[PDB]
Write a structure and sequence with these properties.
The structure is cut from a larger assembly and holds four copies of chain A, one copy of chain B (33 residues) and one copy of chain F (141 residues).
Chain A (H helix, E strand, L loop, with lengths): L1 H6 L15 H13 L13
Chain B lengths: L33
Chain F lengths: L5 E2 L2 H10 L4 E7 L4 H12 L8 E7 L7 H4 L5 E6 L4 E5 L15 H16 L4 E3 L11
Parallel strand pairs in F: 1-3, 2-3, 5-6
Antiparallel strand pairs in F: 2-4, 4-5
The chains are: A mainly alpha (48), B little secondary structure (33), F alpha/beta (141).
Chain F binds one RNA strand of 11 nucleotides through loops.
Subcellular location (chain D): Nucleus; Nucleus speckle
Protein name (chain D): Pre-mRNA-processing-splicing factor 8
Protein name (chain F): Thioredoxin-like protein 4A
RNA sequence: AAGGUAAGUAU
């Protein structure tokens, strides 16, 4: 089942663990994705 | 045997070859001469 | 002197009961959970 | 006289502690007159176990030792060995140490 | 930031309380189940 | 406590120790009402049948039978003592008192192990047996 | 203060 579900794209990337990122690397990638969003650390117009 | 009165004039320590023991001096009544 | 007297008034009962039950003719000598059953 | 009563009480406490020491007819523990308990010889391990006293006995021994120290200081003053000021300083040292 | 390649944020890491409690309980069950057990086995479990 | 056989005088204890020639006599000195004694007696009752082949368990009330209080120092709330062929057997429990077990044991397996070790050592002729568990610490963590 | 008693035959 897992071999077939990895052959096909049954599980989208947001399902963890994904066999490619250890949980510490998952945290690192999550923090990098947070920091890489468009103007994420901006509060000039009250966005939060 | 069970349910049998003790014979008169019998010391429970004697007749069996029992020997006491003292772990310390703070336990038990003082030895009487 | 008074400090050690104040200690003495408190420690006297302990020594008295330890002695009187020691040089007397007759000597005297996990249960919460294994209680109600 | 208070010094006489102190000497009497020191002697009586020594007698009582001596009676407690030779409780089980064991004569390999000796109590001196300064109330120090020491074996009379190199006692064997079984005899060392057989001659054990609880914290209460040693507490009584040490309090009688303190009384002996006080009474001996007063006796030394009464004989003439030490001055009254020396006696007061000695009592202060006894109760501070 | 992967686009500007500049310092933008700062991530502070810390061990969660649950992880610390889990480690403490693991050490406790190592210790308490060590009555008739060799020293080498206890040290191996602690090291692991 | 109320299931194990009871010895009512010093002579009965003497005969109980003397009677058994191939089994270790396990005697609990204490009181039925003592909570420590109730725990010890319920453990003994739990293992009473399993050790039938190599052990016999009796209960002695020290208030009713103060005959052995002086010699055996039966002044703790509970006491368990082992005899073999009319000979008191000591156990290196690690508690400093090898002559008796003077506390209540929870696990029923540990008492079986102690009785088994006592039986082995006594049948080998020993007067002291080293217990499989060291009781210098309650292993509480 | 302890948790540091080898046990066993023999008088």
């Amino acid at each position: 089942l897992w071999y077939e579900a990895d052959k096909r794209r049954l599980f989208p990337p947001w399902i963890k663990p994904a066999d490619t990122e250890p949980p510490p690397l998952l945290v690192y990638k999550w923090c990098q994705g947070i920091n890489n969003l468009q103007d994420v650390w901006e509060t000039s117009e009250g966005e939060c | 045997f069970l349910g049998m009165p003790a014979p008169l004039g019998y010391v429970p320590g004697l007749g069996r070859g029992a020997t006491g023991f003292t772990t310390r001096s703070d336990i038990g009544p003082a030895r009487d001469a | 002197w008074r400090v050690w007297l104040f200690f003495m008034r408190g420690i006297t009962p302990l020594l008295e009961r330890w002695l009187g039950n020691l040089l007397a003719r007759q000597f005297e000598g996990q249960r919460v959970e294994s209680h109600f059953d | 006289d208070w010094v006489e009563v102190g000497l009497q009480v020191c002697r009586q406490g020594y007698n009582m502690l001596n009676l407690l020491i030779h409780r089980k007819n064991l004569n390999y523990l000796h109590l001196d007159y300064n109330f120090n308990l020491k074996p009379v010889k190199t006692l064997t391990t079984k005899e060392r176990k057989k001659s054990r006293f609880g914290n209460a006995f040693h507490l009584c021994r040490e309090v009688l030792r303190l009384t002996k120290l006080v009474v001996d200081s007063h006796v030394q003053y009464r004989l003439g060995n030490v001055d009254a000021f020396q006696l007061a300083d000695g009592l202060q040292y006894i109760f501070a140490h | 930031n992967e686009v500007t390649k500049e310092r933008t944020a700062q991530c502070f890491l810390r061990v969660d309380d649950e992880s610390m409690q889990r480690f403490h309980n693991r050490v406790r069950q190592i210790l308490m189940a060590s009555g008739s057990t060799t020293f080498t086995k206890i040290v191996n479990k602690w090291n692991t | 406590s109320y299931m194990l056989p009871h010895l009512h005088n010093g002579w009965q204890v003497d005969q109980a120790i003397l009677s058994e020639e191939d089994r270790v006599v396990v005697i609990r000195f204490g009181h039925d009402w003592d909570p420590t004694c109730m725990k010890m007696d319920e453990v003994l009752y739990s293992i009473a049948e399993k050790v039938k082949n190599f052990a016999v368990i009796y209960l002695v009330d020290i208030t009713e039978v103060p005959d052995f209080n002086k010699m055996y120092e039966l002044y703790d709330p509970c006491t368990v003592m082992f005899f073999f062929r009319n000979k008191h057997i000591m156990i290196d429990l690690g508690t400093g008192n090898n002559n008796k077990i003077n506390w209540a044991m929870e696990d029923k397996q540990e008492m079986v192990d102690i009785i088994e070790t006592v039986y082995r050592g006594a049948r080998k002729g020993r007067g002291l047996v080293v217990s499989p568990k060291d009781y210098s610490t309650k292993y509480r963590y």
